[PDB]
């Protein structure tokens, strides 16, 4: 019974190998009380923190795909094994996921905690981008992984990755949530505290969408009310948003909205494929696979295809692969890979690490 744990910047997905969906999906947040109790637990992790977020100060242990504080990070893992999965970590091998171009120091800390703090029998860590292609059942393609912390573009050809062509874009869902926060002020709605941030994130996940033509959508919203949508706040208040539904996701293609000099995802995909060899660009053009929760905006694939087609040569066949379950593509691929018979030799034993150290972890891993 191998455990597949996919820890992201904002979301954490966990479950058992062979399953078709993660069993535990809870926010990766740690909350602490900001007031003094008057009726006679100093921290809350996951859904309980979300349920009590009114009196708590929510903090993300991972920021931009970087562990800003490992002490809360261990709490997330401890909450996963004992409070979410309700299993003993020492009895199940654990499959881990790493961001592309993960620092060796980051992997070492992840490895050391797993074998020492939790005393896992065996464990392995795999690239999130590679696992996403496993779920799609493809051996060649370029996957853009846009989650909560950072967006990555990793091209893979015939099972070979190209690290030199891997591009990083410091722009993800959390930045959108902040962008939705700032643009909601012009409509008269004020959200400042960390508790309000989750509320704004819920609105983003429910009412935001990607417009095929941003300029035409702006004209439509300025001359009609058909794009208005209403959201009910937890206190029973209702708010209405218009152009902000498609303005917030537009930062994906126009980072200058956030003041970022970097280019959009559509171009960032184009530079990445432009960086690899000429003979493999054909397969990557027709094998663009979308992964991450930030890719659930409706119509993002259609806008994706139109943008790259303008950049790509006219003779070139552009195919954007957006499976409906790509939010858990990293976890789904991990469960598939862990269920393979030929994966048993990639496992790293606790005794082996105790005598060899993290050197064996840098090897056998990419």
């Amino acid at each position: 019974a191998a455990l597949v744990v996919d820890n992201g910047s904002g979301m954490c997905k966990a479950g058992f190998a062979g399953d078709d969906a993660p069993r535990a999906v809870f926010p990766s947040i740690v909350g602490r009380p900001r007031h003094q109790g008057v009726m006679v637990k100093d921290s809350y992790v996951g859904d309980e923190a979300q349920s009590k977020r009114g009196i708590l100060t929510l903090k993300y242990p991972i920021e931009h795909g970087i562990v800003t504080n490992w002490d809360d990070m261990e709490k997330i893992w401890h909450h996963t094994f004992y409070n979410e999965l309700r299993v003993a970590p020492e009895e199940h091998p654990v499959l881990l996921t790493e961001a592309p171009l993960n620092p060796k120091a980051n992997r070492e800390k992840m490895t050391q905690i797993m074998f020492e703090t939790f005393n896992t029998p065996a464990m392995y860590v795999a690239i999130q981008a590679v696992l996403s292609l496993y779920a799609s059942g493809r051996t060649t393609g370029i996957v853009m992984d846009s989650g909560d912390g950072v967006t990555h573009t990793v091209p893979i050809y015939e099972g070979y990755a190209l690290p030199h062509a891997i591009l990083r874009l410091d722009l993800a869902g959390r930045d959108l949530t902040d962008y939705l926060m700032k643009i909601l002020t012009e409509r008269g709605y004020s959200f400042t505290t960390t508790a309000e941030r989750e509320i704004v994130r819920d609105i983003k996940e429910k009412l935001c969408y990607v417009a095929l033509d941003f300029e035409q959508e702006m004209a439509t919203a300025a001359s009609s009310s058909s794009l208005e949508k209403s959201y009910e706040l937890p206190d029973g208040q209702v708010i209405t948003i218009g152009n902000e539904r498609f303005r917030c996701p537009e930062a994906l293609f126009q980072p200058s909205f956030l003041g970022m000099e970097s280019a959009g995802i559509h171009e960032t995909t184009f530079n990445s494929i432009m960086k690899c060899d000429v003979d493999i660009r054909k397969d990557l053009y027709a094998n663009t696979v979308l992964s991450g929760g930030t890719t659930m905006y409706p119509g993002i694939a259609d806008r994706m295809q139109k943008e790259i087609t303008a950049l790509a040569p006219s003779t070139m066949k552009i195919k954007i692969i957006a499976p409906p379950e790509r939010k858990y593509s990293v976890w789904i691929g991990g469960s598939i890979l862990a269920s393979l018979s030929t994966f048993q030799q990639m496992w790293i034993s606790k005794q082996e690490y105790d005598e060899s150290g993290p050197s064996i972890v840098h090897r056998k891993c990419f």
């Binding site: 602490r32 490992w70 703090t117």
Partner: protein, 393 residues
């Protein structure tokens, strides 16, 4: 009769001002659960992260405020440093154990470090694995206890660089922590097998052993008390952190057993023999809990708790000699964040501004009672006590 008689039931914690802290310190990121800090009334030592090998930063107490990133450090180990300990009889001497399976003892200059320190005074190579436990002898001079991951306990004479005693066939699993007794004659050890062992080093015999002291599999600690009892902090089968009191003459059942919470993180206890107060801090916890140990049942009385909004990475305790006696301060705690060390003042509220004799009984001085050769013979002497009245201003 209504209120249990005590002098510390209202002791409150107060962090020092921002300018009195130490920032811009890259604290070590080693999963080993140690104090990560050693402080003496002259210097502050903190284990830091180095790209190559291991190092710990030693700075004068007066050097507050932001710390230069290029500040010289004690970088002599070829591997990451696991733990550090100041010499009680020499404030300028600190021992360090690292992952390079060696122990090196350093002599800090009076004014601090002007250049990075690489060569140590004495190197101790007796462990086949990483050494994460070091403990100076409370009374005997130039005597150091080292316990590596090889389940081997060694006694060293730093003055002569000689391994005084070797204790190997005594710990079947990894050892958590080791603490000397009051006179230095005995030491207690916590092992991964949930067994607490009291061992005579000069004789190499197991005095007392309690199996399955805590049923949880999480790491657990054990310390000696001044009166001669053992305080163990451990976990239950339901992964609940517990505090236990043990009598070395009767270990069939603990004297007390209280459960604190179900949170993770090992509980590092800090004992104050003068006040008989143990401060319990947990790794990654934002609160410090202090309890009073008395002969009255249930022998463990919860006093109060200082609560913060930030988890700490390690903990260092200021001995009595460096405390501000005039402000009715009984303990100072250097809370270590991921990039900052925040001293915390433990203060007894008192109306009178004069010296409080009851709060400040005679404390062990910085002079060793015996020597290594005398202690080897079997001599036993209590630590020499000094008076804190002179520190009053």
């Amino acid at each position: 009769k209504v209120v249990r008689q005590s002098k510390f039931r209202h002791v409150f914690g107060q962090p020092v001002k921002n300018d009195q802290c130490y920032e811009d310190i890259r604290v070590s990121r080693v999963t080993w659960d140690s104090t990560f800090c050693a402080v003496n009334p002259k210097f502050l030592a903190v284990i830091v992260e180095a790209s190559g090998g291991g190092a710990f930063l030693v700075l004068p107490l007066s050097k507050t405020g932001r710390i230069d990133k290029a500040y010289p450090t004690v970088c002599g180990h070829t591997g990451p440093v696991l733990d550090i300990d100041w010499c009680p009889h020499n404030d300028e001497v600190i021992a360090s154990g690292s992952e390079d399976c060696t122990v090196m003892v350093w002599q800090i200059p009076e004014n601090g470090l002007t250049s990075p320190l690489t060569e140590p005074v004495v190197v101790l190579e007796g462990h086949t694995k990483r050494v994460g436990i070091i403990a100076w002898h409370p009374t005997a001079r130039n005597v150091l206890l080292s316990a590596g991951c090889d389940n081997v306990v060694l006694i060293w004479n730093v003055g002569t660089a000689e391994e005084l005693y070797r204790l190997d066939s005594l710990h079947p699993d990894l050892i958590y922590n080791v603490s000397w007794n009051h006179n230095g004659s005995l030491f207690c050890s916590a092992c991964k097998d949930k067994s607490v062992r009291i061992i005579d080093p000069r004789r190499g015999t197991l005095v007392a052993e309690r199996e399955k002291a805590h049923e949880g599999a999480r790491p657990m600690r054990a310390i000696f008390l001044a009166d001669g009892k053992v305080f163990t902090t451990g976990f239950s089968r339901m992964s609940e952190r517990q505090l236990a009191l043990w009598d070395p003459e009767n270990l069939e059942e603990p004297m007390a057993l209280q459960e604190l919470d179900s949170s993770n993180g090992a509980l590092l206890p800090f004992y104050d023999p003068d006040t008989s107060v143990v401060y319990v801090c947990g790794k990654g916890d934002s609160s410090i809990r202090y309890f009073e140990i008395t002969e009255e049942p249930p022998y463990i009385h919860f006093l109060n708790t200082f609560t913060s909004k930030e988890p700490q990475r390690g903990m260092g305790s200021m001995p009595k000699r460096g405390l501000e006696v005039s402000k009715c301060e009984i303990a100072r705690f250097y809370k270590l964040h991921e990039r900052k060390c925040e001293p915390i003042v433990m203060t007894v509220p008192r109306k009178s501004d004069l010296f409080q004799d009851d709060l400040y009984p005679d404390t062990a001085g910085p002079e060793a009672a015996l020597e290594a050769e005398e202690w080897v013979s079997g001599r036993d002497a209590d630590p020499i006590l000094i008076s804190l009245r002179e520190a009053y201003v």
